[PDB]
Amino acid sequence: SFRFCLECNNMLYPKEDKENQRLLYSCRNCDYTELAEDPKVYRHELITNIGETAGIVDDIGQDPTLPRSDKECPECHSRDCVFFQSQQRRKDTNMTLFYVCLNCKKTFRDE
């Protein structure tokens, strides 16, 4: 996550002080400068799993084309649920199922 300038809404690029030895987020369109909280400047994931379970909506139980199972809900122990596979559509994607209860509407696995 990256922060924005509080006065002109531009991006806050990180900057390093030679004399003070501190990491600071500074806007290049002004003189505003705010002290950085964490040193994690950049992170790149070669193999990522985000978007696998992130594709979830709160009204997925109203879809009539989705199959319905009788798996046990971990939270409220309901007897009706709706399952589907991974929303990510790469070639390496697993065939595991995500179950959605019809009362608490949370996503849970079978393992």
Partner 1 sequence: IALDIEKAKVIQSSIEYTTLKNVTSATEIYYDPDPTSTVIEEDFDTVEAYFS
Partner 2 sequence: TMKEITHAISSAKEQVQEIIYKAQHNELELKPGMTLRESFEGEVSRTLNDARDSAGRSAEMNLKDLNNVKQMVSAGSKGSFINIAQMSACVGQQMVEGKRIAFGFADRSLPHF
Residues that bind partner 2 (CB under 8 A): 65, 91-97, 110-111
Residue 83 is encoded by which pair of tokens?
Answer: 């399952």
In the list partner 1, partner 2, Zn ion, none, the entry touching 77 (Cβ below 5 to 8 angstroms by class) is: none
Residue ranges in 19-58 that form contacts with partner 1 under rule CB under 8 A: 21-23, 36, 39-47
Give the integer Cα–Cα distance in Å for 46 and 18.
Answer: 32
The partner residues of 82 in beta bridges, in order of sequence, read: 68, 100
Identify which of residues 39 and 64 has a Cβ nearer to partner 2 in the complex: 64
The partner residues of 17 in beta bridges, in order of sequence, read: none
* Residue 36 · residue 24 · CB < 8 Å: yes
Smallest distance from the beta carbon of 43 to partner 2, in angstroms? Answer: 27
Smallest distance from the beta carbon of 85 to partner 2, in angstroms? Answer: 8
**Cα torsion angle, 67, 71, 73, 79, sign:** positive
Residues that bind partner 1 (CB under 8 A): 14, 16, 21-23, 36, 39-47
